[PDB]
């Protein structure tokens, strides 16, 4: 998350092709950050029994003051996205913690940013994450959090108030 990745970001900027693995089908797009994402995917997958209970404290203690830009939030999303269903299987508690952690990272990047360009898929990502995983449980926690956002993100996520 901090190799440089932020200031020297690159003309590489385009996230969605970079983060996801199997981009190393060609000899190209073999960025060393994608390797770690794929390895973390594999580890969290085969270890998806009890070692996943360390991810909420990990996020809400370590990942907060190490994120300023938006593709860092996108990397965190590509890390802790697919395993949300594995969590919802039985570990229904940490769901709200991961959700409020995502909301806090969203606020942290919105408060420090010039333009939010790659946020359009993020809106519907969060939409479906609330729609098919949580429901109305994170509502009391996110009502006072979503309001501190930008007018664009506010107009987008307006429908969350229901």
């Amino acid at each position: 998350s901090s190799s440089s990745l932020t200031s020297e970001t690159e003309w590489v900027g385009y996230p969605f092709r970079l983060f996801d693995f199997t981009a190393c089908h060609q000899s190209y797009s073999e960025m060393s950050c994608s390797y770690t994402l794929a390895l973390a995917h594999a580890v969290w997958h085969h270890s998806s029994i009890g070692q996943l209970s360390l991810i909420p404290k990990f996020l809400t203690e370590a990942l907060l003051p190490v994120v300023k830009t938006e593709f860092q939030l996108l990397y965190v999303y590509h890390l802790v996205g697919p395993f949300l269903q594995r969590f919802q299987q039985e570990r229904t508690r940490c769901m709200i913690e991961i959700g409020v952690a995502f909301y806090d990272m969203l606020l942290n990047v919105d408060q420090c940013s010039t333009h939010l360009n790659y946020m359009d898929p993020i809106c519907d990502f969060l939409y479906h994450m609330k729609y098919m995983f949580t429901g109305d449980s994170v509502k009391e926690q996110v009502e006072k959090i979503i309001c501190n956002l930008k007018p664009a993100l506010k107009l987008r996520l307006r429908f969350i108030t229901h």
Binding site: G13, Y14, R17, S29
Partner: protein, 235 residues
């Protein structure tokens, strides 16, 4: 010549402006020609009255433009040296009439008159440039803003920009004259008159300078993706 006498007679009796069309179609064969016709009327009454509102003849001209090629009216208001008269009232009233042209459309000609409407629009833009140059004096308001407003309305994107592009390819001397006039107008566009003034004039200048280059220049971006085409062609 009979049209002048007909117009004087129509002035001697204040018509209801709908019987005027009937009387004009009756006095003339109504089918002989319409390009040997009213295209010379508009100037007489208004430009001649000069310092005067000149009522209901602008209304007769309006009901004329209701059924008339815009090319003739435009080349009329262009060939006329109204800015030489400089009553600051006749041109001010004529701008409101000219507003009706670019607002709705510049109708077809159904013939080779396409070049005619093209020349008409080009000369109309030149006359609007002369309007701005003559009205930007403000040595001591209304005209300096209204002329710019009518110019912006005439330079409506995607409709008349193609017409002006065709005009440039038709001949280049008029475009060079328009460029010289745009430079002369930018010379005064630096005069601090108001916040709104000297602000949209830059937009009009950018539009005029974009006219010749291209209307559909591929300026699109943000197509971030991988190109396998060159990757395979080099292989």
């Amino acid at each position: 010549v009979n049209l002048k006498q007909a117009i004087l007679q129509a002035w001697k009796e204040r018509w209801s402006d709908y019987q005027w069309a009937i009387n004009m179609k009756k006095f003339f064969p109504k089918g002989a020609t319409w390009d040997i016709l009213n295209l010379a009327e508009a100037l007489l009454e208004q430009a001649m009255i000069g310092p005067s509102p000149n009522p209901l003849i602008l209304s007769y001209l309006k009901y004329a433009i209701s059924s008339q090629m815009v090319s003739c009216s435009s080349v009329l208001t262009a060939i006329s040296k109204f800015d030489d008269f400089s009553r600051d009232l006749c041109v001010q009233a004529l701008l409101d009439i000219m507003d009706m042209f670019c607002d709705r459309l510049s109708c077809h000609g159904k013939a080779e008159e396409c070049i005619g409407l093209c020349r008409a629009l080009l000369s109309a833009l030149h006359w609007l440039l002369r309007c701005t140059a003559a009205s930007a004096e403000r040595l001591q308001e209304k005209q300096l803003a209204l002329c710019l407003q009518c110019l912006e309305k005439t330079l409506s994107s995607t409709k008349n920009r193609a017409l002006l592009h065709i005009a440039k390819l038709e001949e280049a001397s008029s475009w060079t004259a328009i460029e010289h006039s745009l430079l002369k107008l930018g010379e005064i566009l630096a005069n601090l008159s108001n916040p709104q003034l000297r602000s949209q004039a830059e937009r009009c200048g950018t539009l005029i300078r974009s006219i010749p280059s291209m209307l559909s220049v591929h300026s699109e971006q943000l197509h971030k993706t991988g190109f396998p085409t060159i990757h395979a062609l080099i292989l």
